[PDB]
Structure 1
Amino acid sequence: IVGGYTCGANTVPYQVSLNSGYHFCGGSLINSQWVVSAAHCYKSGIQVRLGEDNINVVEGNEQFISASKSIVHPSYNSNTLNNDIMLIKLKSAASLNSRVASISLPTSCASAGTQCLISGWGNTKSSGTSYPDVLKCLKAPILSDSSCKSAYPGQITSNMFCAGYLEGGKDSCQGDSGGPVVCSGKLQGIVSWGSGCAQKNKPGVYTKVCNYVSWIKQTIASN
Structure 2
Amino acid sequence: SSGSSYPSLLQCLKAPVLSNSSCKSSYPGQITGNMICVGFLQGGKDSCQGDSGGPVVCNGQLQGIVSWGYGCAQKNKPGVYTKVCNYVNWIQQTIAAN
Q: TM-score, normalised by structure 2?
A: 0.99
**Counterpart residue number, 1:161:** 36
Look up the equivalent residue of 1:140 and give its one-letter code.
Answer: A
Q: What is the 5 A alignment of 1:195-206?
A: 195-206=70-81
Matched, 1:127 2:2: yes
Q: Which residue of 1 aligns with 2:59?
A: 184
* AA at the equivalent of 1:168: G
Poorly superposed stretches of 4+, deviation over 2 Å? none
What is the DSSP-based 3-state SS (H/G/I as helix, E as strand, rest coil) of the residue aligned with 1:131?
coil
For this pair of structures, how many residues does the alignment match?
98
Distance across 2 between alignment mates of 1:142 and 1:210 = 13
Residue 44 of structure 2 aligns to a residue in which SS? Answer: coil
Residue aligning to 1:149:
24
| Aligned residues with identical type, % of pairs | 82
Once residues 219 and 132 of structure 1 are traced to their aligned partners in structure 2, the CA distance between those partners, rounded to angstroms, is 33
Q: Which has the higher strand share?
A: 1
Partner SS state of residue 90, structure 2: helix
1:187 deviates by 0.4
Distance 2:91 2:43 in 1: 33
Provide the rounded CA distance (Å) in 2 between the counterparts of 1:153 and 1:146: 10
Instruction: State the 1:128 CA deviation.
Output: 0.5
Shift of 1:214: 0.2
Unpaired runs of at least 5, structure 2: none
Larger radius of gyration: 1
| 2:18 counterpart letter in structure 1 | L
**Match for 2:80: what amino acid?**
V
Q: Whose helix proportion is higher, 1 or 2? A: 2
Per-residue CA deviation, residues 107-143 of structure 1 (Å, 9 max, x unaligned), is xxxxxxxxxxxxxxxxxxx210000011000000000
